Amino acid sequence: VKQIGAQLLPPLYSLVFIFGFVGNMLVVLILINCKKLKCLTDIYLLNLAISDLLFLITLPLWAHSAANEWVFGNAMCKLFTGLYHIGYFGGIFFIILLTIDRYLAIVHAVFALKARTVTFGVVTSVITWLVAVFASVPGIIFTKCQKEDSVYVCGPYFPRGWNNFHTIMRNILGLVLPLLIMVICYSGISRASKSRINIFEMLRIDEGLRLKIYKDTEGYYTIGIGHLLTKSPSLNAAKSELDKAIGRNTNGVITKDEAEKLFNQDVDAAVRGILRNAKLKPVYDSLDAVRRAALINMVFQMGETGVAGFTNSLRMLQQKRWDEAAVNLAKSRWYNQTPNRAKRVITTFRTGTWDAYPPPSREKKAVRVIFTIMIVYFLFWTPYNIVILLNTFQEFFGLSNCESTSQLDQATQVTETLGMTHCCINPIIYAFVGEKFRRYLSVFF
Ligand SMILES: CCC[C@@H]1C[C@H](N(C)C(C)C)CC[C@@H]1N1CC[C@H](Nc2ncnc3ccc(C(F)(F)F)cc23)C1=O
Ligand SMILES: CCCCCCCC/C=C\CCCCCCCC(=O)OC[C@H](O)CO
Ligand SMILES: CC(=O)C1=C(O)C(=O)N(c2ccc(Cl)cc2F)[C@@H]1C1CCCCC1
Ligand SMILES: [Zn+2]
Numbered sequence: 001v002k003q004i005g006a007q008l009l010p011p012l013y014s015l016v017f018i019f020g021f022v023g024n025m026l027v028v029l030i031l032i033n034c035k036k037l038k039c040l041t042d043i044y045l046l047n048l049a050i051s052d053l054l055f056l057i058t059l060p061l062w063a064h065s066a067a068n069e070w071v072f073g074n075a076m077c078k079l080f081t082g083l084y085h086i087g088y089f090g091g092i093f094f095i096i097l098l099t100i101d102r103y104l105a106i107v108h109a110v111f112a113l114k115a116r117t118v119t120f121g122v123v124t125s126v127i128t129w130l131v132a133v134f135a136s137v138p139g140i141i142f143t144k145c146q147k148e149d150s151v152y153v154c155g156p157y158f159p160r161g162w163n164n165f166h167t168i169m170r171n172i173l174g175l176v177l178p179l180l181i182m183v184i185c186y187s188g189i190s191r192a193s194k195s196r197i198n199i200f201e202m203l204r205i206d207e208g209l210r211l212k213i214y215k216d217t218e219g220y221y222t223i224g225i226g227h228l229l230t231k232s233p234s235l236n237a238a239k240s241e242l243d244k245a246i247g248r249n250t251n252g253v254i255t256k257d258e259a260e261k262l263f264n265q266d267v268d269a270a271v272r273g274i275l276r277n278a279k280l281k282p283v284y285d286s287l288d289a290v291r292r293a294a295l296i297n298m299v300f301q302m303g304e305t306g307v308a309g310f311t312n313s314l315r316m317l318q319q320k321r322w323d324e325a326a327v328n329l330a331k332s333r334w335y336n337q338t339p340n341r342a343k344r345v346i347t348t349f350r351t352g353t354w355d356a357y358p359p360p361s362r363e364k365k366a367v368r369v370i371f372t373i374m375i376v377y378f379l380f381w382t383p384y385n386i387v388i389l390l391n392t393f394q395e396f397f398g399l400s401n402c403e404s405t406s407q408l409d410q411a412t413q414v415t416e417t418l419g420m421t422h423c424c425i426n427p428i429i430y431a432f433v434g435e436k437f438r439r440y441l442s443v444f445f
Contacts, residue, residue: 009066012063013066014059014060014063016420019428021053021057023426023427024424024427026427026444027427030441030444031046034443035440037118039116039118040120040121041098043122043125044098044101045094047128047129048426051086051094051132053087054083054090055084055087055420056424058080058087061076069153072145073145077143077145081139085132086132086133088174089131090128092173092377095178095373095374096178096374099178099181099182099185099370099371102366102367105363105366106366107188108260113257114261135173138158138162138166142156144157167389168392171385175385179378182374195353195354196359196363197360199296199297200263201357201358201359202354203297205357206297206301206341206344207226209256209259210223210224210259211255212254213229213239213252224254224263225260226301227245227263229241235252246258246262271284271296273304274295274299277304279314280299280308280314283295288352290352290353291348291352293348294345295317302334310332310334313328313329313332322349322350326346326347326349329346329349330342344357369430369434373429376425380418380419384416384418387408391408391409
């Protein structure tokens, strides 16, 4: 096999090195000089880029050894084995973190939004690098520089039991764990909604989204998704009430996530009020999560006193007569005064679906990117994980032969070579799938 390796590995690894280095370097430059590392997700992508770099800087040494032999010493051997493993495990770990993060985001997990901070990022990133190191320790310890058949090699020399342990450990952290994580996420996504629409999207369309302190048509002061600040002229009074509700010096400006944080506080407060009203409680209890949202929508607009005015319609809703309740609501004063908003609320109540509203785009496009990242990772590293599992545990089960181990080694070499060419793929996936990344490239050039 060595003959083929000397002709193929040096140009292959060199080409991978060139594309991967400038690729992940561009990713880092963007995250620092365009995104400025302000978001939690910017931290993970930064560490993911670092993982690939830590990996591919080792390529020139592996390619040189294939052409000649290992000449850098034992200490250098254990060092680059460390970068090789740490870069690898760090890679898949930070892909999983991003996978979870963007999953929780499209389901609008409240605690995840409250956790979406650079502080939470730095901490969990430090722990992630630790686990990556501890998973690299066995590889480092039993890897040495030794003269085999009058040729120097930087290779692994595990005892019988330790090679078995290392194999199953690698398969868990690099296959079983990510696979399970992804299944959880796919399930949680498909169970939330088929249209991926939450109450957040609904009231964002109907009530709007204020990033700057907005003066109501009457004279009231609002912010975010329909949040009353005060009812009196002074904008200083408005800023005063807002700066208290956030805990920050806002100067009358809010951020998108701060809006949803406020929004969540207003939703459960509305639900709290509904479940405390004698006429709204039995209706609310007989409704599913979709039609309940439409009721919260009406409370968001007219208040519980106003919603309680629809005595007829409420009873019909309470009795699951959607069609008839829909028609009756189209005759109300509320309907004729604000027809377009009412119409799509009436539809929600009638059909019990989000068909009256447009689905989220960027939220879906986000999980499209990160799931693709992980699927492609699987493509590149799964054939290696399996063939070494066969070459370890299940070679005792069956598959036994004299030329077996030799051929299983060949397959191990080839598949690992395949996996080693993955450290240059992520930035390419960004450019092909991710629209924000291409936008960052447009302003870079
Ligand atoms: C040549 C140095 C091998 C080196 C070992 C190192 N190792 C896990 C620890 C020391 C970190 C990881 C990185 C390197 N590896 C691990 C295997 C991978 N493929 C190969 N290795 C060595 N001869 C090969 C010859 C032909 C072929 C082909 F399939 F193309 F024909 C592939 C080869 C590689 O390269
Ligand atoms: C060598 C041959 C193999 C090469 C080919 C393998 C490449 C597969 C990569 C990604 C799969 C698509 C990932 C899709 C990510 C999930 C998309 C999603 O969930 O959003 C859809 C949305 O629900 C719609 O309404
Ligand atoms: C929808 C979205 O948030 C993104 C893109 O449409 C895109 O190209 N992004 C993007 C941003 C920076 C970098 Cl370096 C690479 C990216 F792909 C962001 C990613 C945010 C992390 C999860 C995956 C999507
Ligand atoms: Zn959403």
